[PDB]
Amino acid sequence: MYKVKVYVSLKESVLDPQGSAVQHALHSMTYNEVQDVRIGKYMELTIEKSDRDLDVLVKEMCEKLLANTVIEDYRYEVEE
Amino acid sequence: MYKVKVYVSLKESVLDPQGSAVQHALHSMTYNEVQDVRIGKYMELTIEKSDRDLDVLVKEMCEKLLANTVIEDYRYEVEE
Amino acid sequence: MYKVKVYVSLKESVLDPQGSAVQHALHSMTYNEVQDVRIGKYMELTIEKSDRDLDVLVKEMCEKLLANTVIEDYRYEVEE
Amino acid sequence: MYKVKVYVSLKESVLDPQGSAVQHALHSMTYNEVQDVRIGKYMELTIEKSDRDLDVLVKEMCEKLLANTVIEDYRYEVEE
């Protein structure tokens, strides 16, 4: 069946304090080479064939539960 | 300058209650085609070159901060 | 009309890798005073009275949708 | 030691599609009495005494990692 990878991330149009804090933490740990840090959610969904088309199913789930399209962008990839 | 993509996910032998809870809700919402849900993290770190080797640096950041390697696996890809 | 507060948290005997990962990061960020981290969900549902008993209704919503009772505990409090 | 309860929620000033979807799901399941649904994150942090004051520690952690104060509100309660 299918392995669907979903990436959910804060829209770039929003201040990201958490990413800033992680970047600073890395510097404090002496990994001063870091210039920017971005952290998002990564999901792996195993999906079995059904009457619904795969693309319709995934977006429906991201629009309703896996994401808040008001403040986050989401994208996906499918593998077998 | 490099852009490091890091994928953090629970080890195969580790149960993922967060995903298991999401799977349950999805099922109640009629998405019974979802067989399994694994929730992890995706990150993009921009880094400058230094005296440190690329492989040595990414592994340290991952083991020391990005992932709790006792329960999480990590894999990375680098682009210019 | 009632306001139902629901607290969903992993059962004591269930490991919480999400929290364990957050705990690890917190430690690296110098917050070693954190001994344990358990991550769950909090919800507030506004409901109208009906023929259903209050206790019967809240338990069904919790068991059927709000929480995956195989791994999660739930407790609720109600206000007017 | 201390048991700190942290509640992280989307600011009321933001559209909440996920809450809307859960509300609709409840109606579809015949729990039509539901009028509104709000879902937030609930965390339980066990904290041991240190040189830092408890209130300073908690807010620092919420401002840096446990929350994104741009889109979410957070509050906490402490018990022994």
CB B75 within 8 A of CB B51: no
Helix (H, G, I), strand (E, B) or coil at C61: helix
Query: In units of Å, what resolution does this entry have?
Result: 2.0
Shortest Cα–Cα distance, D4 to chain A (Å): 20
What region, left, alpha or beta, does residue B30 occupy, with left being phi > 0 and alpha being psi -120 to 50 degrees?
A: left
Look up residue B73 and give its amino acid. D
Phi, psi of C2 (to 5 degrees): -100, 155
Report how far residue C37's alpha carbon sits from residue C23's, in angstroms, rounded to the nearest whole number: 6
Give me the CATH number covering residue D29: 3.30.1280.10
Nearest CB among A33, A44, A65 relative to B25 is that of: A65
| C30: number of Cβ within 10 Å | 12
> From CA C36, how far away is CA B18, in angstroms rounded?
17
Answer for the pair D79, D2: CB distance below 8 angstroms, yes or no.
yes
Closest C-alpha to D23, from C46, C69, C57, C5: C46
Residue A58's domain spans which residues? 2-80
Interfacial B residues in 7-46 facing D (CB < 8 Å):
25, 28-30
DSSP C33: T
The two tokens of residue A23 are: 């970047």
Chains in contact with A, where contact requires at least 3 CB pairs less than 8 Å apart: B, C, D
Please name the method used to determine this structure: X-ray
HEC sequence for chain B? CEEEEEEEEECCCCCCHHHHHHHHHHHHCCCCCEEEEEEEEEEEEEECCCCCCHHHHHHHHHHHHHCCCCCEEEEEEEEC
| H helix or E strand, kind and range, residue D62 | none
| C-alpha distance across the termini of chain D, in Å | 6
Contact predicate A22/D68, CB 8 Å: no
Handedness of CA A31, A32, A33, A35 (dihedral sign): positive
Measure CB to CB from residue B17 to each of C23, C24, C71 and give the nearest one.
Answer: C71
Residue B27 token pair: 């099922």
Q: How many domains does chain D have?
A: 1
